[PDB]
């Protein structure tokens, strides 16, 4: 005797701005209505009950509020690990339904990887690193990557100016780094590609002999 | 002067959605502002100006709104037309502005057919790619699966097809050799694999479904790039 | 075994008109011809199959025929949303081809904005851009460029008032662009001088109206590489 | 030239806690040492680098040390956004490498719920669901089952009802699955019959709570496939 339809599936906004989610009850509509915050690997956390409690120890930006048959939460200023995916609940006497949920993500300088796929062993593939906010020539470029649930490990890196080239053993022969200073761009050229590939691959700009600025990498899957 | 911040930059959201996008006026403020509307590869088209005052020939479910600096743009029943990207504007007496733009972009979608090709970009002659293409809202197995690009400003060109239960593939003359299309059932996928790239395969490659000898569903499609 | 030869490959119409669309098919031929509509920037629509049959929610001033090797599209009552670029299908049990399409176009009185003047240059090279009115009187109203870069979000560039050519200008471009009007003509202009990358975007031409600019031209695109 | 070993793998800890985590360089040896910080489907972030210098925002919480060969990561006082897996990088003028990482978990309140029994199985087999729970009597309150499938939403399977076990079941699942409650042993039970691929999902058990659900295990993985 309930059902609940929610508006946004995703939104992307930046921090402190006001976020509004909805969820519509289309039948039976009381104000038996929760919202739960859910974080990438973990289960939900209860934000709200009774369609605009504030649950206990969460903080005061969140609010709920009902009107007719719409419920809506508020994120008023959003903060970084305010990006997570967002449910609504409502329950009757008999039964109890959960709206589709809305992701909210985030977003100077700022890196873009692209070229990732499924793609069939033995074949090659290219990957692009667009940088903006800062002119990549001038800095030392690194290619690390992630196979899934494993660790950081490094994989290329190109130097400013001259574009000497660094490898690490697992990839020397194979990956060849490269950069376009016309296009602001760097490349990664990957051969005889195989299962070890397989790996969210991350660009990041040099800087304090380490890696200030990352890219959120692009998913290689071989097979 | 004026300056306009826009929220979201982007939403997701399907057919019968109210949809909420704000502009803040973070200077001087009046009710000289406007909201438009953008589909790609078309110009800007006027949704609404002094800040709620409907513009001839555009739908009643578009309204705007104000409260202080917070103006707001309201879609009260998403409909499929409705996905571009927004732009409030504001004007003052010596200056003009706009916000940042939100993309209103289709969900994914439930039970409804949909299809969404990946996989394109840039790549030198001779270089390959693998084009992906998920169905939602059906089996794939069940049907016929197409690929079908346009060169930019050109025609559309049948490139390949496979078949259900069976898997026989046909193929375009222009790509015999190059390309091979497949299919992955468990993952209700199809794909494109495109080796020996030449300038002239550039261009948006759609993938759709067969229906009544022809092709009743069809993607966004996926843009490749071959350029020396 | 198939092969489509489509005509027009673009034609003029008005609203209300009878428009046809044929396609022969100069090898093999079955009833299994199929018509799709497609609108810039978006995918093809399916609108008949089987050379006669109505798709479902296609409205029915669309209609096909077939005559010997010759099938045709027919628009009873052209309509403004109809104006596009159609193509015909054909399938054998071996090969699928299309016709090479047709574009159906619109035509007077209509307010109407064209720019022209974009290509590619150096930077520190120059370009001059124009927009030439018709349907209304351009030293009426105030005239804006707006441009936008790939990928972005639209900047205003420059305004120029009615009947005194008043000119104003975003920062971005002080000192190097110069809105100007030639009214006796009906076209605005955008000179742009000392170009530097970040330039680069399709720059549209509007017209001023309801404090707002309620229409503009389809743009024109302008590239800034070394 | 260079190489790290980087421990604990991994450890568990409260907020509040002093926590260290260790990287030895086996080879070559410099200052040139960075540790970064890195939350679930998001990228690394730099927390210290040459060893010691705090990047620009990072809270005054974190710290790094030398002794020797060996590099350390301080966090004086674990705060909730703390946990997280970290990562120590070492460079030389040819080489990078990267510790194997230390995931740092959250340690559970006095109210745990812990489901297993999850497991693979073909279509039309069978599995039963445990959630253990502490810290509260069971007897007293509504508990619930709830699952979400591989990158879709929360779905509610079944309740069952404080002291006198009431069940209520989704359709989805009514006449194959069973909820049932052992309040002597502080343990739900969700009996799952009839087993079809749409049942593959983490399945979470959870706790009653101002008409809501406060309390909620890590969930149990089931996988349905032929
Ligand atoms: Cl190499
Ligand atoms: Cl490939
Ligand atoms: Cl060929
Ligand atoms: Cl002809
Ligand atoms: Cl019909
Ligand atoms: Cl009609
Ligand atoms: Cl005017
Ligand atoms: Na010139
Ligand atoms: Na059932």
């Known amino acids: 005797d309930i059902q609940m339809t929610q508006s946004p599936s995703s939104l992307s906004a930046s921090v402190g701005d006001r976020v509004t989610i909805t969820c519509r009850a289309s039948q039976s509509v009381s104000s038996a209505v929760a919202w739960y915050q859910q974080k990438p690997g973990k289960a939900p956390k209860l934000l709200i009950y009774s369609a605009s409690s504030l649950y206990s120890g969460v903080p005061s930006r969140f609010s709920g509020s009902r009107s007719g048959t719409d419920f809506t939460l508020t994120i008023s200023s959003l903060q970084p690990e305010d990006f997570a995916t967002y449910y609504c609940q409502q329950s009757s006497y008999s039964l109890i339904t959960f709206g589709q949920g809305t992701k909210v993500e985030i977003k100077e300088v700022q890196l873009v990887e692209s070229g990732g796929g499924l793609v069939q062993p033995g074949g090659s593939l290219r990957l692009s690193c667009a940088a903006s906010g800062f002119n990549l020539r001038s800095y030392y470029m690194h290619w690390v990557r992630q196979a899934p649930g494993k660790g950081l490990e490094w994989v290329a890196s190109i130097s400013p100016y001259y574009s000497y080239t660094y490898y690490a053993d697992s990839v020397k022969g194979r990956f060849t780094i490269s950069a376009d200073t016309s296009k602001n761009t760097a490349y990664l050229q990957m051969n005889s590609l195989r299962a070890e590939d397989t790996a969210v691959?991350?660009?990041?700009?040099?800087?304090?002999?380490?890696?200030?600025?990352?890219?959120?990498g692009t998913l290689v899957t071989v097979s | 002067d004026i300056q306009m911040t826009q929220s979201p930059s982007s939403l997701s959201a399907s057919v019968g959605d109210r949809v909420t996008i704000t502009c803040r006026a973070s200077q001087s403020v009046s009710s000289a502002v406007a909201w438009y509307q953008q589909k790609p590869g078309k110009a800007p088209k006027l949704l609404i100006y002094s800040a709620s005052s409907l513009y001839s020939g555009v739908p009643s479910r578009f309204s705007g709104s104000r409260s202080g600096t917070d103006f707001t743009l309201t879609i009260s029943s998403l409909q499929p037309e409705d996905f571009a990207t927004y732009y409030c504007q504001q004007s003052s007496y010596s200056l003009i502005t706009f916000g940042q733009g939100t993309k209103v972009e289709i969900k994914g979608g439930g039970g409804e057919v949909q299809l969404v090709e990946s996989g394109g970009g840039l790549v030198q002659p001779g270089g390959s790619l693998r084009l992906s293409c998920a169905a939602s809202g059906f089996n794939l197995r069940s049907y016929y699966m197409h690929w079908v690009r346009q060169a930019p400003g050109k025609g559309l060109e049948w490139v390949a097809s496979i078949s259900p239960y069976y898997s026989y593939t046909y193929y375009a003359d222009s790509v015999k050799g190059r390309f091979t299309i497949s299919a992955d059932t468990s993952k209700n996928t199809a794909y494109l694999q495109m080796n020996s790239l030449r300038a002239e395969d550039t261009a948006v490659?759609?993938?759709?479904?067969?229906?009544?000898?022809?092709?009743?569903?069809?993607?966004?499609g996926t843009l490749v790039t071959v350029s020396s | 075994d198939i092969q489509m030869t489509q005509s027009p490959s673009s034609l003029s119409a008005s609203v209300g008109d009878r428009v046809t669309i044929t396609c022969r098919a100069s090898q093999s031929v079955s009833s299994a011809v199929a018509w799709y509509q497609q609108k810039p920037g978006k995918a093809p629509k399916l609108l008949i199959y089987s050379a006669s049959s109505l798709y479902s929610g296609v409205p029915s001033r669309f209609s096909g025929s077939r005559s010997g090797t010759d099938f045709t599209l027919t628009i009873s009552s052209l309509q403004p949303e109809d104006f596009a670029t159609y193509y015909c299908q054909q399938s054998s049990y071996s090969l699928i081809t299309f016709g090479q399409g047709t574009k159906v176009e619109i035509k007077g009185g209509e307010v109407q904005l064209v720019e022209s003047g974009g290509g590619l240059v150096q930077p520190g090279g120059s370009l001059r851009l124009s927009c030439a009115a018709s349907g209304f009187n351009l030293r009426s109203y105030y005239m804006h460029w707006v441009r936008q870069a790939p990928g972005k979000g639209l900047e205003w560039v420059a305004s120029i008032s009615p009947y005194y050519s008043y000119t104003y200008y975003a920062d971005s471009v002080k000192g190097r662009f110069t809105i100007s009007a030639d009214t006796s003509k009906n076209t605005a202009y955008l000179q742009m001088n000392s170009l530097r990358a970040e330039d680069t975007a399709v720059?549209?031409?509007?017209?001023?109206?309801?404090?707002?600019?309620?229409?503009?031209?389809?743009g024109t695109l302008v590239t800034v590489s070394s | 030239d260079i190489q790290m070993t980087q421990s604990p793998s991994s450890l568990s800890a409260s907020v509040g806690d002093r926590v260290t985590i260790t990287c030895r360089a086996s080879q070559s040896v410099s200052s040139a040492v960075a540790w970064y910080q890195q939350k679930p489907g998001k990228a690394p972030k730099l927390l210290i680098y040459s060893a010691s210098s705090l990047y620009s925002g990072v809270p005054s919480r974190f710290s790094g040390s030398r002794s020797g060969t060996d590099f350390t990561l301080t966090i004086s006082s674990l705060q909730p956004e703390d946990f997280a897996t970290y990562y120590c990088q070492q460079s030389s003028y040819s080489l990078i490498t990267f510790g194997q990482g230390t995931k740092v978990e959250i340690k559970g309140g006095e109210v745990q719920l812990v489901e297993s029994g999850g497991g693979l199985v073909q279509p039309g087999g069978s599995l039963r669901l445990s959630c253990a729970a502490s810290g509260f009597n069971l007897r007293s309150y509504y508990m619930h089952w709830v699952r979400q499938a591989p990158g879709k939403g929360l779905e509610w399977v079944a309740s069952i009802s404080p002291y006198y076990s009431y069940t209520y079941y989704a359709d989805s699942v009514k006449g194959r699955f069973t909820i049932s409650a052992d309040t002597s042993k502080n343990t739900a039970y969700l009996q799952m019959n009839s087993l079809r691929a749409e049942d593959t999902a983490v399945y979470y058990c959870?706790?009653?709570?101002?008409?809501?659900?406060?309390?909620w295990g890590q969930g149990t993985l089931v996988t349905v496939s032929s």
């Open positions: 959870a706790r009653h709570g101002y008409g809501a659900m406060d309390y």
